[PDB]
């Protein structure tokens, strides 16, 4: 159930419209957050003075609201329809798509959980090591950094194929937005 070279029979340039069609309007929100959020990986004196307050926390919570803002937004006009296909493409994609923007939102979600964490049991001591928080912040860190960019590049694919839109076939396919659990 892969779009390997059945999708270049039924005229593979809907990908290449899909992309182009897309906006770059859910993209450029989280795309713009992308980069804010794996800057931190820093993790040197300036993580330090952004972490030792709400500083970072107050930034990524924003990243969240606007890809939440913006995906919410065009996966309504979405739901409408459901990709050009609904039938073995489609029905893949659509569980794929559920656990890309559950994970994209549960990353994302958890480093700003994490940086406050990890700073409140270090404000907690200061005077203590500081070595060993920044040795583990850098490490949980990492690896949400690591898999939100996985689960953020996946969850492009996933919706980019969704923003298609089929016509009749959807008109009748509520199951997208079924799975979308969104208004």
Same mark, same amino acid.
Do not use: N
């Given at each position: 159930?892969?779009?390997?070279?059945?999708?270049?029979?039924?005229?593979?340039?809907?990908?290449?419209?899909?992309?182009?069609?897309?906006?770059?309007?859910? /993209?450029?929100?989280? *795309? =713009?957050?992308?980069? !804010?959020?794996?800057? &931190? #990986?820093?993790?040197?004196? @300036?993580?330090? $003075? +952004?972490?030792?307050?709400?500083?970072?926390?107050?930034?990524?919570?924003?990243?969240?609201?606007?890809?939440?803002?913006?995906?919410?937004?065009?996966?309504?006009?979405?739901?409408?329809?459901?990709?050009?296909?609904?039938?073995?493409?489609?029905?893949?994609?659509?569980?794929?798509?559920?656990?890309?923007?559950?994970?994209?939102?549960?990353?994302? /979600?958890?480093?700003? *959980? =994490?940086?406050?964490? !990890?700073?409140?049991? &270090? #404000?907690?001591?200061?005077? @203590?090591?500081? $070595? +060993?928080?920044?040795?583990?912040?850098?490490?949980?860190?990492?690896?949400?950094?690591?898999?939100?960019?996985?689960?953020?590049?996946?969850?492009?694919?996933?919706?980019?194929?969704?923003?298609?839109?089929?016509?009749?076939?959807?008109?009748?396919?509520?199951?997208?937005?079924?799975?979308?659990?969104?208004?």
């Amino acid at each position: 159930k892969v779009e390997q070279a059945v999708e270049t029979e039924p005229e593979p340039e809907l990908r290449q419209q899909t992309e182009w069609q897309s906006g770059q309007r859910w /993209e450029l929100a989280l *795309g =713009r957050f992308w980069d !804010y959020l794996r800057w &931190v #990986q820093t993790l040197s004196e @300036q993580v330090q $003075e +952004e972490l030792l307050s709400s500083q970072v926390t107050q930034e990524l919570r924003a990243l969240m609201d606007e890809t939440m803002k913006e995906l919410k937004a065009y996966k309504s006009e979405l739901e409408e329809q459901l990709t050009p296909v609904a039938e073995e493409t489609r029905a893949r994609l659509s569980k794929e798509l559920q656990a890309a923007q559950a994970r994209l939102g549960a990353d994302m /979600e958890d480093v700003c *959980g =994490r940086l406050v964490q !990890y700073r409140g049991e &270090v #404000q907690a001591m200061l005077g @203590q090591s500081t $070595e +060993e928080l920044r040795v583990r912040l850098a490490s949980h860190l990492r690896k949400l950094r690591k898999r939100l960019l996985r689960d953020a590049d996946d969850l492009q694919k996933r919706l980019a194929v969704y923003q298609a839109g089929a016509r009749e076939g959807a008109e009748r396919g509520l199951s997208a937005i079924r799975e979308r659990l969104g208004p």
